[PDB]
Design an enzyme around this catalytic site. Structure first.
Site, PDB file in Angstrom:
ATOM      1  CG  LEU A   1     -85.134  55.649  27.788  1.00 39.32           C
ATOM      2  CD1 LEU A   1     -85.660  56.496  28.936  1.00 39.32           C
ATOM      3  CD2 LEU A   1     -84.779  54.243  28.254  1.00 39.32           C
ATOM      4  CG  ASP A   2     -91.412  59.623  24.763  1.00 34.52           C
ATOM      5  OD1 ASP A   2     -91.515  59.214  23.587  1.00 34.52           O
ATOM      6  OD2 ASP A   2     -92.163  60.498  25.240  1.00 34.52           O
ATOM      7  CB  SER A   3     -89.106  60.118  20.616  1.00 35.17           C
ATOM      8  OG  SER A   3     -90.323  60.790  20.890  1.00 35.17           O
TER       9      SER A   3
END
Ligand SMILES: NC(=O)C1=CN([C@@H]2O[C@H](COP(=O)(O)OP(=O)(O)OC[C@H]3O[C@@H](n4cnc5c(N)ncnc54)[C@H](OP(=O)(O)O)[C@@H]3O)[C@@H](O)[C@H]2O)C=CC1
Ligand code: SF4
Ligand code: SF4
Ligand code: SF4
Lengths: 80, 156, 208, 287, 176, 53, 114
Positions: free
Chosen positions: A38-40
């Site tokens: 997942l991304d930030s």
């Protein structure tokens, strides 16, 4: 009724309510940034989604420094 | 055909009634507004033709798009145009309004006003000297004189 | 020479020369150039740090009042490492003189928000922020003046072309006004008018 | 082909596209949206009209500067229509009223009109004549409208054999008849299976079929994705609108599938279901 | 040198203050304003009866964009492009070809009346005075196509009259 | 005017009194009502052809 | 070679400000779709918001990231007020195709764009 596993269960089904996660996969050291891909962006989505769910503001440096759902539960028990 | 005779005479009557007054709204952004005020002047009347300057878009017969139409303006212009009663007619006054004009090759200027509303009477000039605008309003009145609306409602 | 040519007044030339030499010798910290034109209106060319001290010094000090502020334009010049030019214009009520404070600036590093000392620069800073991109540091309200809201691109630059990148039109499918990429109706012929043969010999810059 | 008929560069707004389209009708609903998509394409559209020029005035400026052209015709003279379609690439037949006038029944509009204009178009020598019909308009009973559309299908398939016969289902948009008719009612409750399809998918299908080559002859039918009960649709209409004889028989006939002939999947466009576009179009309820 | 307004004081004499209080209580100068407006009521109105009495003009009005031609002769233009160079709206569009006679000529000469700001630069820039700002200002155009003039529309606009334009130029060939 | 040696002006700019007058609308209408705001827009001759540059 | 930075020293405060701006835009959207009476669900609007954030995801100069923070904050102010009307908020979307694809073959039948 301020039960820690109640906080755990409600975090678990609102992560279930988050539809872009596969699977739910509750852990104590999950680290859903890199171990789940997942991304930030989605990190801060989840953090202020917990803010949307049950209360306090949960500021942005803490959103940079949570990284893990059990650590979110421990942070809520620290703060609330 | 006495019915066609009645419909023709009654269409003539109601089209005369439509072309009688034709009170406009003065939209009027730039110096074309000053020229609309100068055909509202005491020399060139408007009340002789039934025309009255009026700031009521809820009842205005025709709309006179005059001035330089811009991108920051055009949604507000069409939002004025949309709360207008359905028998509606449009006079595009001025070089800026009838095809872009002097600020044509420029950002934030709509190239004409066909890109926003339909146009019935173009009246060019910069500013169109008030005699030319008044002749344009006469040709708008004769456009209302040629409508055959009720005849098409008969033979539809 | 005596008809058809506007004469110049060397009295005012000497006076503005002595005054600019005075200002330059008493503020050494930020001064680079004090140039005097032929028509005697002063230009003071300034590093982008002492904007607030030079303006507070030039509002007061009773040797030069200059209470009146006029325009600010930062005219965009390529082939400079620091591109843009902030041109303050200052007018004295008591003295009848005009000084053009030209401080230079780059694309990104801000000048220091002259609205705190001259209240007439509020919309000037907001407008030049919209049209250029010169940021102003610790300014109250920075919005877009003289453009559309959804528009961006800072159109008074030289990289922004004459015709914009958008073109509005109404359509009935989505029942509203929408923007498409630009479609001209005529080419806008940009003619070649730079004729040779050096009409001004006094401005021949030294070549390489 | 001569020059200035080939396309040029990008698309639309004086970017000259390829087609030259003559559209019959084009005063009402679907013709208006199709003229709008051809003005987005940037072509030249010959629209003739018999009615008052105020209506073509309100649908006028959708084309660019002098691209579309207005002319005149009638339902009686072949010569005026031949004058209208003297010089054209393609021609589309979109005509028809859903009630009898005093001067025209459903007789001779669907019967006389496509025969005459298809005859003079074949005498002119144009390509890709696209004729509309409705879905499930058979020979059978209960509707003069549907049996005359069946006769018109037989006519357009009989003469000028390489005509593109097209048929949508019950189509809805901003100025629909049946969906706004369900909005502007009063009441009765029955059962019927039915599919709607939003109007921009239908007209994008028409423009893709009219500019993409070698699809002539094969009749098409436009299929919505939902395909469910009419009564659930009417309860959905009352729910979103917040308020708890010929046309009513033509909507209580049925809507069944004819799955042999293709749809949008051989054309490549999204078919938008009822939910999104219906919440879009159902404004103007209470407050 | 200056002359500034509103430096007095209201008086302390009883007569002056009771005159001002009489103005206050008795609506006096309001009635004097009514008298002034009735004095302009009884004038004769200076309206011109428009379609029969047209408005006054100048010898040098800038109107119609009509070309001219030689006395008992051919077209006056050259296609020398000076009007297109000076045209600030850039509404002039010229394409030139020479013909079989040898002398240079045109093919296409379009004025965008939409774009034309009606200056006079093309009137004053033509070295042979071919294009002339015409006399009359009555355009009143329904469509948007018709406000794009060709060379033939300009020549028919200059052959429906030249004697007017010839009278204007023969009146004022000395100023310009 | 800013002029490179040429036949074209390199950059003009216009200082507008209407823009300078309209800049102080808060300090003219800090303590009044909307009809007085229309009076303030009247008492400074705005035309907005010039207030826009 | 001395440059005065706008807001940030290194990329840490830049990342902090841009994720703060994304949090504000996330909690700002349903107010806009309730106020301007748009025609698009919440999911599609949030997906194009995160698309526009992911478009410029490779710029590392902290001055530029601060200046984009200022741009997004100006647009957030002017959309949280009722200034920018329905036209501009629909103008952020692209439903008026322009379906111009990125093949070679369809770019070849409508040519002059390699
Ligand atoms: N459910 C639906 O809506 C469906 C509709 N269709 C077809 O789509 C078309 C357009 O639909 P709709 O919304 O009803 O739009 P219209 O009914 O307005 O379109 C019909 C056109 O024919 C013109 N016309 C009317 N009477 C005559 C006449 N006697 N002679 C010649 N022309 C006439 C109309 O007005 P004018 O004279 O002013 O041009 C109009 O331009 C119709 O042909 C319909 O059959 C097909 C499938 C489904
Ligand atoms: S057409 Fe001419 S007179 Fe009218 S607004 Fe434009 S510049 Fe002013
Ligand atoms: S300036 Fe005169 S001669 Fe030259 S092209 Fe124009 S109209 Fe013709
Ligand atoms: S009057 Fe001016 S704008 Fe009109 S054609 Fe002549 S030079 Fe061009």
């Amino acid at each position: 009724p301020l039960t820690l596993e109640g906080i755990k269960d409600r975090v678990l089904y609102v992560l279930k309510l988050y539809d872009k996660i596969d699977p739910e996969k509750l852990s104590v050291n999950s680290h859903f940034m890199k171990d789940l891909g997942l991304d930030s962006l989605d990190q801060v989505e989840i953090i202020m989604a917990m803010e949307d769910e049950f209360g306090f503001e949960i500021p942005d440096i803490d959103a940079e420094k949570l990284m893990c759902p059990q650590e979110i539960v421990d942070y809520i028990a620290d703060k609330k | 055909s006495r019915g066609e005779y009645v419909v023709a005479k009654l269409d003539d009557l109601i089209n005369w009634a439509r072309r009688s007054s034709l009170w406009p709204m003065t939209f009027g952004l730039a110096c074309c507004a000053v020229e609309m005020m100068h055909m509202a002047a005491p020399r060139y009347d408007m009340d002789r033709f039934g025309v009255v300057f009026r700031a009521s878009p809820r009842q205005s017969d025709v709309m006179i798009v005059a001035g330089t139409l811009t991108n920051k303006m055009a949604p507000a212009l069409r939002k004025v145009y949309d709360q207008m009663p359905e028998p509606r007619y449009v006079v595009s006054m001025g070089s800026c309004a009838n095809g872009g004009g002097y600020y044509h090759y420029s950002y934030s200027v709509v190239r004409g006003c066909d890109r926003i509303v339909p146009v019935d009477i173009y009246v060019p000039g910069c500013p169109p000297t008030a005699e030319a605008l008044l002749y344009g309003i006469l040709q708008l009145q004769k456009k209302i004189k040629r409508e055959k609306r009720l005849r098409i409602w008969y033979r539809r | 020479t005596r008809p058809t040519v506007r004469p110049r007044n060397d009295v005012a030339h000497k006076q503005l020369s002595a005054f600019g030499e005075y200002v330059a010798e008493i503020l050494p910290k930020y001064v680079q150039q004090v140039q005097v034109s032929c028509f005697s209106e002063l230009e003071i060319c300034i590093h982008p740090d002492g904007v607030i001290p030079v303006l507070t010094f030039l509002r007061d000090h009773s040797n030069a009042q200059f209470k009146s502020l006029a325009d600010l334009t930062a005219v965009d010049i390529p082939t400079r490492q620091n591109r843009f030019e902030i041109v303050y214009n200052l007018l004295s009520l008591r003295f009848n003189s005009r000084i053009r404070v030209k401080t230079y600036t780059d694309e990104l590093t801000p000048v220091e928000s002259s609205v705190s000392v001259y209240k007439a620069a509020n919309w000037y800073e907001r407008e030049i922020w919209d049209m250029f991109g010169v940021f102003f540091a610790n300014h109250p309200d920075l919005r877009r003046i003289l453009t559309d809201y959804g528009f961006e691109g800072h159109p008074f630059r030289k990289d922004f072309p004459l015709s914009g990148y958008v073109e509005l039109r109404y359509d009935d499918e989505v029942k509203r006004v929408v923007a498409e990429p630009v479609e001209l109706a005529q080419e806008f012929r940009k003619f070649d008018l730079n004729s040779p043969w050096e009409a001004f010999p006094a401005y021949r810059q030294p070549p390489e | 082909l001569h020059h200035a008929v080939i396309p040029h560069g990008k698309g639309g707004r004086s970017s000259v596209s390829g087609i030259v389209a003559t559209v019959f009708g084009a005063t009402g609903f679907l013709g208006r949206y199709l003229v709008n998509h051809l003005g987005r394409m940037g072509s030249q559209v010959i629209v003739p009209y018999r009615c008052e020029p105020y209506d073509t005035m309100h649908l006028r400026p959708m084309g660019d500067l002098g691209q579309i052209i207005f002319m005149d015709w009638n339902g009686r003279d072949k010569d005026s229509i031949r004058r209208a379609v003297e010089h054209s690439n393609v021609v589309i037949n979109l005509v028809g009223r859903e009630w009898e006038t005093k001067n025209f029944d459903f007789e001779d509009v669907f019967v006389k009109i496509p025969q005459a204009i298809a005859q003079v178009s074949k005498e002119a020598g144009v390509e890709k004549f696209i004729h509309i019909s409705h879905l499930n308009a058979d020979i059978k009973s209960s509707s003069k409208y549907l049996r005359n559309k069946a006769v018109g299908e037989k006519e357009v398939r009989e003469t000028f054999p390489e005509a593109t016969i097209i048929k949508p289902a019950d189509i809805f948009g901003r100025e629909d008849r049946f969906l706004n008719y369900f909005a502007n009612i009063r009441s009765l409750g029955k059962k019927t299976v039915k599919q709607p399809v939003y109007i921009v998918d239908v007209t994008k299908g028409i423009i893709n079929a009219i500019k993409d080559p070698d699809a002539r002859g094969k009749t098409f039918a436009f299929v919505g994705p939902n395909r469910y009960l009419l009564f659930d649709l009417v309860q959905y209409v009352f729910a979103v609108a917040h308020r708890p004889r010929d046309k009513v028989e033509r909507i209580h006939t049925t809507d069944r599938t004819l799955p042999h002939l293709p749809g949008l999947e051989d054309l490549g466009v999204q078919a938008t279901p009822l939910e999104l576009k219906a919440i879009e179009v159902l404004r103007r309820h209470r407050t | 040198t200056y002359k500034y307004v509103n430096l007095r004081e209201p008086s302390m004499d009883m007569k002056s203050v009771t005159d001002r209080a009489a103005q206050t209580l008795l609506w006096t100068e309001l009635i004097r304003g009514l008298g002034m407006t009735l004095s302009y009521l009884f004038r004769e109105p200076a309206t011109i009866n428009y379609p029969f009495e047209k408005g006054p003009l100048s010898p040098r009005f800038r109107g119609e964009h009509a070309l001219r031609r030689y006395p008992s002769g051919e077209e006056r233009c050259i296609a020398c492009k000076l009007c297109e160079a000076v045209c600030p709206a850039q509404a002039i569009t010229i394409e030139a070809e020479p013909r079989a006679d040898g002398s240079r000529r045109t093919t296409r000469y379009d004025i965008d009346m939409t774009k034309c700001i009606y200056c006079g630069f093309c009137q004053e820039a033509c070295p042979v005075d071919a294009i002339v700002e015409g006399p009359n200002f009555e355009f009143s155009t329904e469509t948007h196509e018709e406000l794009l003039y060709n060379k033939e529309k300009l020549l028919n606009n200059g052959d429906k009259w030249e004697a007017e334009i010839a009278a204007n130029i023969q009146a004022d060939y000395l100023y310009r | 005017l800013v002029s490179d040696g040429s036949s074209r002006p390199y950059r003009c700019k216009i200082k507008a009194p209407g823009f300078a007058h309209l800049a102080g609308l808060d300090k003219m209408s800090k303590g009044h009502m909307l009809a007085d705001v229309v009076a303030i827009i009247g008492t400074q001759d705005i035309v907005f052809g010039e207030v826009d540059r | 070679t001395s440059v005065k930075p706008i807001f940030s020293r290194d990329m840490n405060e830049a990342k902090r400000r841009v994720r703060e701006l994304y949090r504000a835009w996330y909690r700002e959207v349903p107010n806009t779709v309730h106020l301007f009476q748009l025609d698009i669900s919440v999911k599609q609007g949030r997906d194009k918001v995160r698309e526009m954030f992911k478009k410029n995801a490779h710029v590392t100069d902290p001055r530029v990231v601060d200046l984009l923070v200022i741009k997004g904050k100006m647009e957030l102010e002017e959309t949280i007020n009722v200034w920018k009307q329905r036209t501009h908020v629909m103008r952020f979307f692209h439903e008026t195709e322009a379906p111009r694809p990125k093949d070679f073959l369809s770019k070849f039948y409508v040519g002059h764009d390699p």
